[PDB]
């Protein structure tokens, strides 16, 4: 029941001060490398992304692995849809008056990410070996995003990922997503579409130079200004449960990936996936009474009912750009999506003794 629940929830806590300071390596590191990158010519106006529970940049996606977004403003974009994907896109710029520093990495008309991603990579791991204080290791990484792995002291790894920023209006494939309406307002959703967006070099299946784009920074917003009410969990009386609600979701995929490790049925699962089911499901209930802390074990059973039926339906709508399925046959094979619907269905309809202690 609930109490269970809360009781893993307090057991989460005991975590909080080991990755606080784990989180503050990656910090220290990060910012040391920010300020090399500003040297090349091309990386000038590299920042730090908004996008992290610790210091602003530095985001938890399970126990020890952090991830970091590297941001890069680059004027005068231009998108062309790789086709109909929806979620990729080949960069190119909108006017030629004066010539982009990226000019580097132009192949054609086309800015190349893995041209930009091996300059990025060469100052990283120039910087990584030139540090005689703390050892360091950069592990280069499956494709595109994240660009670099680092690997700090034993087990702290933080992926770092760079994202051009383009302050133009959002792409025509996102404008039927972000369903927030009736749930955080239209005032909102117009206030959030006013902000940048992102492009990672992630690439399509083998390759291409093709990016993705990326909404980490309304992602956290809406999790950290989560309610109907604008005072949710600003005092006593609207202590809601969608935090703890999405944590458990989370410690779930977790731990039923360390369980079936054997055979590794459940590696291409993520927590954005269930992020991704959360928002969904925010959507689905959007008055924050349907959030009541009282609620608890409703309300993460709501979440785990429709992360099954995303699971049985292979379908999982990206939040931000509705025609693209993070669940299609192309990113998650067919058995893979079978095998967890049986075992999330397991977990549910036996009150998930993957969370008991005996
Ligand atoms: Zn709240």
């Given at each position: 029941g609930a109490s269970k629940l809360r009781a893993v929830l307090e057991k989460l806590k005991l975590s909080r001060d080991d990755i606080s300071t784990a989180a503050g390596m990656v910090k220290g590191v990060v910012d040391h490398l920010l300020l090399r990158l500003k040297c090349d010519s091309a990386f000038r106006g590299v920042g730090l992304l908004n996008?992290?529970?610790?210091?602003?940049?530095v985001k938890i996606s399970a126990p020890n692995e952090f991830d970091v977004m590297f941001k890069l403003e680059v004027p005068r974009i231009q998108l062309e849809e790789y086709?109909?994907?929806?979620?990729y896109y080949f960069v190119k710029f909108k006017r030629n008056p004066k010539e982009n520093?990226?000019?580097?990495?132009?192949e054609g008309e086309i800015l190349s990410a893995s041209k930009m991603l091996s300059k990025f990579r060469k100052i990283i791991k120039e910087e990584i070996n030139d540090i005689k204080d703390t050892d360091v290791i950069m592990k280069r990484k499956r494709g595109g995003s994240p660009a670099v792995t680092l690997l700090i002291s034993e087990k702290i790894s933080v992926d770092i990922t760079l994202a051009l920023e383009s302050k133009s209006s959002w792409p025509a494939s996102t404008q039927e997503g972000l369903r927030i309406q009736n749930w955080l307002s239209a005032k909102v959703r117009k206030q959030l579409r006013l902000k940048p967006f992102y492009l990672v070099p992630k690439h399509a299946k083998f390759q291409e130079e093709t990016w993705r784009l990326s909404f980490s920074h309304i992602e956290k917003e809406i999790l950290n200004?989560?309610?109907?009410?604008?005072?949710?969990?600003?005092?006593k009386e609207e202590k809601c449960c969608r935090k703890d609600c999405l944590k458990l979701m989370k410690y779930l995929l977790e731990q039923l990936k360390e369980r079936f490790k054997?055979?590794?049925?459940?590696?291409?699962?993520?927590?954005y996936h269930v992020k991704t089911a959360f928002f969904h499901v925010c959507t689905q209930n959007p008055q924050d009474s349907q959030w009541d802390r009282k609620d608890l074990g409703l309300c993460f059973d709501n979440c785990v009912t429709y992360f099954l039926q995303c699971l049985r339906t292979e379908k999982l709508e990206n939040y931000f750009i509705p025609?693209?399925?993070?669940?299609?046959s192309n990113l998650i094979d067919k058995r893979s999506k079978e095998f967890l619907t049986k075992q999330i269905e397991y977990e549910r309809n036996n009150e998930f003794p993957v969370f008991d202690e005996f």
């Amino acid at each position: 029941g609930a109490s269970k629940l809360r009781a893993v929830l307090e057991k989460l806590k005991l975590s909080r001060d080991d990755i606080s300071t784990a989180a503050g390596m990656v910090k220290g590191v990060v910012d040391h490398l920010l300020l090399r990158l500003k040297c090349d010519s091309a990386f000038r106006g590299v920042g730090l992304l908004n996008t992290g529970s610790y210091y602003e940049h530095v985001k938890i996606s399970a126990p020890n692995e952090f991830d970091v977004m590297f941001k890069l403003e680059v004027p005068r974009i231009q998108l062309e849809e790789y086709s109909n994907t929806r979620a990729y896109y080949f960069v190119k710029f909108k006017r030629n008056p004066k010539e982009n520093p990226l000019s580097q990495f132009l192949e054609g008309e086309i800015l190349s990410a893995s041209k930009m991603l091996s300059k990025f990579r060469k100052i990283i791991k120039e910087e990584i070996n030139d540090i005689k204080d703390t050892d360091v290791i950069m592990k280069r990484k499956r494709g595109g995003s994240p660009a670099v792995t680092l690997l700090i002291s034993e087990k702290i790894s933080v992926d770092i990922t760079l994202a051009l920023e383009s302050k133009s209006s959002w792409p025509a494939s996102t404008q039927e997503g972000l369903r927030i309406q009736n749930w955080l307002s239209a005032k909102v959703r117009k206030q959030l579409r006013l902000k940048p967006f992102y492009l990672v070099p992630k690439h399509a299946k083998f390759q291409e130079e093709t990016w993705r784009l990326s909404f980490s920074h309304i992602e956290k917003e809406i999790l950290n200004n989560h309610g109907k009410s604008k005072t949710c969990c600003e005092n006593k009386e609207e202590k809601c449960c969608r935090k703890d609600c999405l944590k458990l979701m989370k410690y779930l995929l977790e731990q039923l990936k360390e369980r079936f490790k054997d055979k590794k049925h459940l590696d291409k699962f993520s927590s954005y996936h269930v992020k991704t089911a959360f928002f969904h499901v925010c959507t689905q209930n959007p008055q924050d009474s349907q959030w009541d802390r009282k609620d608890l074990g409703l309300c993460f059973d709501n979440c785990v009912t429709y992360f099954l039926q995303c699971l049985r339906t292979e379908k999982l709508e990206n939040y931000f750009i509705p025609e693209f399925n993070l669940f299609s046959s192309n990113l998650i094979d067919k058995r893979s999506k079978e095998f967890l619907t049986k075992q999330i269905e397991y977990e549910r309809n036996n009150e998930f003794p993957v969370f008991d202690e005996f």
